[PDB]
Amino acid sequence: PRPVVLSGPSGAGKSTLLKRLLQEHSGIFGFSVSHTTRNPRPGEENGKDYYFVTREVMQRDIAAGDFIEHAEFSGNLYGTSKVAVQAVQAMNRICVLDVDLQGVRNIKATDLRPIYISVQPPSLHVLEQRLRQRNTETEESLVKRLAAAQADMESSKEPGLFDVVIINDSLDQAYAELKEALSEEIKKAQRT
Numbered sequence: 001p002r003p004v005v006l007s008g009p010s011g012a013g014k015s016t017l018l019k020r021l022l023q024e025h026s027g028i029f030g031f032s033v034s035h036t037t038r039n040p041r042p043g044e045e046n047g048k049d050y051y052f053v054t055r056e057v058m059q060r061d062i063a064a065g066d067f068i069e070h071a072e073f074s075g076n077l078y079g080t081s082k083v084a085v086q087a088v089q090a091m092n093r094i095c096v097l098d099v100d101l102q103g104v105r106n107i108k109a110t111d112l113r114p115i116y117i118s119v120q121p122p123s124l125h126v127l128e129q130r131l132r133q134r135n136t137e138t139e140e141s142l143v144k145r146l147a148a149a150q151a152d153m154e155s156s157k158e159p160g161l162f163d164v165v166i167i168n169d170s171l172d173q174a175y176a177e178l179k180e181a182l183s184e185e186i187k188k189a190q191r192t
């Protein structure tokens with residue numbers, strides 16, 4: 001039973017598929033609650049979606065060595081803390097992570113030994129509409145995320161970087177491809 005790392009462009013639907021997975025398989029998977037310096041969106045709860053901390057707190061923790069990995073994204077800091085992964089391990093659950101491309105390569109350097117899945121948009125055109133539908137991004141921050149998306153899409157074709165690439169055209173189909181990709185993960189977890 002290996003950890004799971006979900007990545008992809010902003011707005012692809014990796015958080016959506018993760019939420020569906022975590023509700024239907026609550027006893028099998030446990031979400032890695034990362035730290036972030038950005039403000040919480042409406043409907044986001046501190047401790048569940050993210051550990052919302054200020055910039056000074058994040059930098060203080062980085063010096064203290066609390067983070068397995070950390071990176072900046074659209075002028076805000078994100079990080080997978082050691083305590084976040086150890087919390088899921090203490091619950092006897094498969095840790096699932098939602099990081100960017102920079103985190104993916106950082107995790108490659110660690111010993112977490114995960115399975116890498118890239119949730120990809122059907123095309124870059126529909127990604128903008130997906131990002132524009134949520135409206136949480138201002139026009140300036142939307143362009144920054146859209147620009148970084150193409151770099152993420154290009155790197156998704158790198159051989160060996162991702163174990164599974166899922167195109168998120170149909171959400172039910174994308175979730176079906178997610179479960180099948182985790183079939184041996186769910187099997188091994190239930191096999192104990």
Ligand SMILES: Nc1ncnc2c1ncn2[C@@H]1O[C@H](COP(=O)(O)OP(=O)(O)OP(O)(O)=S)[C@@H](O)[C@H]1O
Binds near residue numbers: 008011130133169171
């Ligand atoms: N299958 C889908 N069909 C259409 N729109 C979708 C689909 N999945 C997600 N979206 C859109 O994508 C947004 C929600 O996806 P999220 O999971 O929050 O984005 P994300 O891939 O996690 O990237 P970030 O880092 O959270 S911005 C909304 O605007 C949805 O309308």
Ligand SMILES: Nc1nc2c(ncn2[C@@H]2O[C@H](COP(=O)(O)O)[C@@H](O)[C@H]2O)c(=O)[nH]1
Binds near residue numbers: 070
């Ligand atoms: N490297 C890294 N990236 C993260 C982490 N948490 C979220 N991200 C990434 O940061 C971006 C913004 O996330 P959002 O602010 O939309 O939740 C997404 O690409 C997401 O996957 C993290 O802990 N580490």
Ligand SMILES: [K+]
Binds near residue numbers: 032034098
């Ligand atoms: K995350």
